[PDB]
Amino acid sequence: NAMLFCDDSKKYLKEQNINLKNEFDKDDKRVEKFSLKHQNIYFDYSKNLINDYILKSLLESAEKSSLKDKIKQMFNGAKINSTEHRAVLHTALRDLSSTPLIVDGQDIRQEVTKEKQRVKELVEKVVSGRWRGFSGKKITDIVNIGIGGSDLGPKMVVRALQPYHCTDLKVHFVSNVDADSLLQALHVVDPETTLLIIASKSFSTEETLLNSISAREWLLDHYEDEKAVANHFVAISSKLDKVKEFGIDLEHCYKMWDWVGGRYSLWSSIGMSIAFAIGYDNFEKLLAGAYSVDKHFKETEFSKNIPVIMALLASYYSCTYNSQSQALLPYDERLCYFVDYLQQADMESNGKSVNIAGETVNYQTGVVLWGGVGTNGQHAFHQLLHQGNIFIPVDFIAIATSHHNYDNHQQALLANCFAQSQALMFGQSYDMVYNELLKSGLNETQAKELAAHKVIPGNRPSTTILLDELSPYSLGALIALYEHKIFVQGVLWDINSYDQWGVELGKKLGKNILKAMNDDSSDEYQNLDDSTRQLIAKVKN
Amino acid sequence: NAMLFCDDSKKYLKEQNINLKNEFDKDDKRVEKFSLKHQNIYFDYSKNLINDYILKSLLESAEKSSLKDKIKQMFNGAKINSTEHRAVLHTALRDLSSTPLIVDGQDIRQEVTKEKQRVKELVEKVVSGRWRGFSGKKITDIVNIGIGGSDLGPKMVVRALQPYHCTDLKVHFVSNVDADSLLQALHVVDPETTLLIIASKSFSTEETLLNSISAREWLLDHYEDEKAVANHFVAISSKLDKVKEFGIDLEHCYKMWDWVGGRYSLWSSIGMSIAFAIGYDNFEKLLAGAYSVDKHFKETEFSKNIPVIMALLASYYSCTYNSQSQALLPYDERLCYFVDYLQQADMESNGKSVNIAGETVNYQTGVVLWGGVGTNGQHAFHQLLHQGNIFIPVDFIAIATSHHNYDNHQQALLANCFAQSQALMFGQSYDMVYNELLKSGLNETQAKELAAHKVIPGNRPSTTILLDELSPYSLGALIALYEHKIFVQGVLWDINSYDQWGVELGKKLGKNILKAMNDDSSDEYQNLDDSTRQLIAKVKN
Ligand SMILES: O=P(O)(O)OC[C@H]1O[C@H](OP(=O)(O)O)[C@H](O)[C@@H]1O
Ligand SMILES: O=P(O)(O)OC[C@H]1O[C@H](OP(=O)(O)O)[C@H](O)[C@@H]1O
Ligand SMILES: [Ca+2]
């Protein structure tokens, strides 16, 4: 009996027939109405297909929903991950309020602070040269071993904050079970000067198991002494018992709690590889940026709340226009893994077919998130954004100031960013094109023939999110905005954003198939569908 | 009056209600019927929502269409890029047939062969050390400067064939106007030992202009002698006149013809950076692989023609199921830029709203292409593929044998690949889950409460394309399959796959905005919409 977001009312707000050009021409307060600021982030949603009436209707749905209660429940540690009976407390990992928070018998403020102090001490000991390898040498390289949430957030952040690297360590990310991943690291590191991190909440992920065992075999092939493990491995894991079976001391094991989802874990000890690149001070700045957005999100009325507006716009489009994807276009090379990261956060959260009560929902939930770095994407897929016939909401991320003095490059980068949202809004009509082709020197026949092919419909929506700079703090704020967008969408859809039951089956079938690959007399082999059986046969012959 | 692909007939083939499990159970010839082989590529489309009747209907549409004629027209050099009155001859770049081909007065076989011999000689002269920089030193680094089709194909191929690198040169790719891109190269190269490639068909792309000028300024800041340009720059361009204004001799200018689209250009002299990484012999192998697929595509009846089947399945889904995206999942780390590459090839080709006659089409055309490397994607977005409520066709790319001896890693990689397509097909029912939860130790209440959340609907389609290995030849074959898929889809939709008029407007608006940024009394500034005006104001303040 939760409120229905995608109802008849929404599907009919569309009938306002918003024309963006007309709105900007007639409403001199358009930008003021449909933009917000949070510190040095400017959120301009004024090129969206909205007016006052549509935004009001959307905000009413939010106000009528359980959202206000759910925000409080998330921050207070209520078990909002209902199918796993877990709290959802990535927010606590970056808290600066120091308000009381006791969850499941633990003082969360103490737990989080003490674990940060441990990671900080590890990083300082390694960077200072107090940590030595087994043969007595200073560490020069860090290799993170993990997949999904134990890989992508740290990898994305390390790249995004490349200008802030300052520890003299090189940080490498091993993830896929495809041994190419492990080999790219091993080919450029020395066992005597490398610290390996096993990043695994469960300590039983197939890929990370094989990678970690293989890395240990490489280390021990070199040293020929099991005692070397102590100087060359640390672990992060919620499952402290499996860490000791692998051979790692508790003093080299870092905590991860059940209330930290993998795809919300970069803020935890899982982010230690971030700290090993940019230093612990900068890691604190990253967390502080996120905290600023957490405070905004928790305290701000919905009509002025950036993540709530992001969520309402996205769910409005996917409900009313039946769009099945959203495009995210970061106009900075440093953000090259940002789409990949948000794919995980968004799609694994909101790709759900049942509501909290377990009922199959009759409305569409999470859509495909995709995109690409600008300006490059302009020469790859923006043709489709401009002249295709797919409805796709677009977010642009712009960074006002970069990390260098090529000011002509930076100005062109921004001009392009802004031109692309302007082009989506305006398009170009048959009459504009036809007249332009005549002025180019085409005769009437030629111009008539070509003009239709150059028509760009326009009236296509976008949001632009402008940062003053891409720093640890502003990046942390940017990520947190999207974390909260995703939460709001899940609440409005009445789904559990924080479980992931859909992946279990493939893990089981994978074990079965590996058995079938190694024994064709097995029940596993006999029960295969014939597509799977012949694929296995082809990778033997 | 072209044939309509997405007609009432198609929209109703859906009513067959294909159940994949039932089909594999009842049809012991399912795989034989719905798989094809081309040399050492195995194409298994048997997990698609098809049976004999649906495939027959689809093949009838292809047979009734202009496709047979259009294939001949493409290879013969007819002006199938109708809006630009151009031939479309990327196929000729890799030809091994040596059949007669005279287009626009040129002997295409002679033109292509002579240009290859020039690139081969350049690569040998640089690799051998006969090419010296201006101070007399051997080259160690190659920097490609280009964007879109002048960047992504070469970048993707160089990564994909990393195990085959053999020239002792490091190859770097500068593309975005964001100066981070140029700086990542300049920070690790020495002007005295670097050869720079300006890859630009037009020689007037904004980004490449700024990058090339900036690179020249860096070179000349070092040498302080304009004569050094001759030893440190080469150009690829269809526009030989602009190359000389930049300062580059014709002897250092490589050809590009109008009939080579940018997004089909890696096979041309634009691919020289590929050759500088893997050697010219391996570049020939890459072209030979593509040729093998060109011969397959041109000569094979439609029912056994892999690109035609790929196209029919894709357009069937996007017509009948109204899907708006397709997922491409390469199970090899080396293919990390393959989705990015195919996004350009597919979306910039088929993101079109008018037919060849210029009429607005009433059916959906090109959809969003996205995806991600496996197994990593399993921990990011496969949750949505399994339990979301979006219909998304899925292609898996598997490689039977890798480039190392971690056979346990490779077997797990493949088991996962096959498990994921198997999981999409089968899913898991409420009854299976409920019974499993009881056997796990949950009581009836608990199992009832959780079971619905673990239901995986299944009956979701996939294709698996299996290569024996990822070599220059097999990669070339793989890319060509998709080039021809895209061509077939465009023909069936009656669109021009080979123009890109939609990007022009944003280039114009970008020039206007840059003027507005530098002069607020300009007409450009006064004509801005207020969203654009305030974004410009915010990146000054
Ligand atoms: O080794 P651990 O950190 O336990 O798990 C690794 C990753 O696997 C999970 O994905 P999924 O839930 O399998 O889709 C998360 O992405 C998590 O970070
Ligand atoms: O410098 P040149 O090679 O002339 O062009 C660079 C790139 O720009 C084009 O994109 P679009 O047509 O602008 O979307 C192609 O991707 C081309 O390779
Ligand atoms: Ca209320």
Ligand SMILES: [Ca+2]
């Ligand atoms: Ca026919």
